[PDB]
């Protein structure tokens, strides 16, 4: 998506009915920054949230 929300009035969305893919986002590495807390950034996609 080319349009991320305005920060002035940003809106949180909720995620359900997903196959976790943290390791997919991470491995494709399209984002330059991947810094995780509580979850290893080193592809930890073993967990179920």
């Amino acid at each position: 998506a080319t349009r991320f929300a305005s920060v002035y009035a940003w809106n949180r969305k909720r995620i359900s009915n997903c196959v976790a893919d943290y390791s997919v986002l991470y491995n494709s590495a399209s984002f330059s920054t991947f810094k995780c807390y509580g979850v290893s950034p080193t592809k930890l996609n073993d967990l179920c949230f």
């Binding site: 509580g38 979850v39 290893s40 950034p41 080193t42 930890l44 073993d46 967990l47």
Partner: protein, 49 residues
């Protein structure tokens, strides 16, 4: 150990181990003191017998 990067896990684990060990040490010490009181009672019973 399955959620955090190894060194992050080491910090969180050290916090948890210390907590668990201090709870056990408190427990063991209290039983050791109560056990001593029980020994004293047992010695009295043996005398009465």
């Amino acid at each position: 150990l399955s959620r955090l990067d190894p060194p992050e896990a080491e910090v969180q684990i050290d916090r948890l181990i210390t907590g668990r060990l201090q709870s056990l040490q408190t427990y063991v010490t209290q039983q050791l003191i109560r056990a001593a009181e029980i020994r004293a009672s047992a010695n009295l019973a043996a005398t009465k017998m």
